[PDB]
Amino acid sequence: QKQPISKLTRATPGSAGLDLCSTSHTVLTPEMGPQALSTGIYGPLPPNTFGLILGRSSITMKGLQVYPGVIDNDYTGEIKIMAKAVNNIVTVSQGNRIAQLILLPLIETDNKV
Amino acid sequence: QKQPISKLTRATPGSAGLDLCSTSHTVLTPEMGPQALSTGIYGPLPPNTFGLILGRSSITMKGLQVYPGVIDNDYTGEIKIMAKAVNNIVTVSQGNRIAQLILLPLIETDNKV
Amino acid sequence: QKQPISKLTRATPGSAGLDLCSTSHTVLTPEMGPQALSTGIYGPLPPNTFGLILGRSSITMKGLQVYPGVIDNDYTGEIKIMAKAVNNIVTVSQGNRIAQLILLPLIETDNKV
Ligand SMILES: O=c1ccn([C@H]2C[C@H](O)[C@@H](COP(=O)(O)O)O2)c(=O)[nH]1
Numbered sequence A, B, C: 001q002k003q004p005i006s007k008l009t010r011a012t013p014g015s016a017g018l019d020l021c022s023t024s025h026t027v028l029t030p031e032m033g034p035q036a037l038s039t040g041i042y043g044p045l046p047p048n049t050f051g052l053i054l055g056r057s058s059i060t061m062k063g064l065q066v067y068p069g070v071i072d073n074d075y076t077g078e079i080k081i082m083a084k085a086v087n088n089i090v091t092v093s094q095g096n097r098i099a100q101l102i103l104l105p106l107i108e109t110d111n112k113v
């Protein structure tokens, strides 16, 4: 894109997630397996947070599975949605809100690096 | 139901999750795809938190997949468990603990709404 | 093993997750359904935190699904990765980093126990 995370919108003040759409029209089938969908949105994330990509319920019920994805605080690449058609052919129109990004606190530990 | 989240119980003081059961007896097969299971439990959530629905390991190993679900802080509807039979026929008895609700902090950002 | 969580490493300072490998060579197929992979790493977790097991994207794209798993703060058993081959035969070499553990804050509520 390259657009940053600050450009994403949350649907309501109580909404935990920032909505993510695919930039492309994509058709998915079960036998295709996991596919990485492009968003045109780029890390990195606010200080001391990491990101979690999760599906929206509406889209899940429609047979599109979003695999939970961890976004590191310092990742500066494109944020892609890992998705699979569950049972049937799923068609993703450009600009449909497929997933959501949740920001979570990044806990410090003494683990080696 | 309508019952609130305060009515849920956690199995041990160290348990991260509040246990969720289905109110109905339900049979699930792989070709059915994602099904929304009723809990009779309703949002909303404590201030400055959001909720995450996740599966229990025992139930996962038994072939019932729970799709991660985000519950918004201000959602006042019924909390439903999005589930799928993975490989085989899964039978869910009324009152079996199928999923768990985790409460997480809702981080404030300057994202447009 | 028994090794504690403090022995795990994080790949970069910005990495949210602690990397998890299987201790065994394992072959997985779709018809096998969910399998619990041994890590040789044991709870419990730092005070006031709980753990979440999630997949790595690279491994997900390769057709290995990791089911999100909650680790309770006071769990003192072995941390196992719940996994399934999605579409094809997946082979897991001993010592490949399959999953990651994320630490999250454990919120106190007045829920009965
Ligand atoms: O597993 C789930 C996921 C979502 N919801 C409810 C709570 C959410 O705030 C609301 C809207 O979800 P989305 O379609 O925007 O994901 O649906 C559930 O009951 N269970």
Ligand SMILES: O=c1ccn([C@H]2C[C@H](O)[C@@H](COP(=O)(O)O)O2)c(=O)[nH]1
Pocket (backbone or CB within 6 Å): B055, B056, B057, B058, B059, C053, C067, C068, C069, C070, C071, C072, C075, C078, C079, C080, C081, C082
């Ligand atoms: O992916 C997982 C999920 C759970 N557990 C362990 C830690 C939990 O505290 C314990 C009990 O899990 P449940 O059956 O209640 O989900 O199992 C794992 O090792 N890996």
Ligand SMILES: O=c1ccn([C@H]2C[C@H](O)[C@@H](COP(=O)(O)O)O2)c(=O)[nH]1
Pocket (backbone or CB within 6 Å): A053, A067, A068, A069, A070, A071, A072, A075, A078, A079, A080, A081, A082, C055, C056, C057, C058, C059
């Ligand atoms: O759904 C996902 C999961 C991961 N990533 C990006 C951000 C991560 O920091 C980076 C590396 O992920 P891993 O392979 O280590 O999981 O990939 C995504 O864009 N989408």
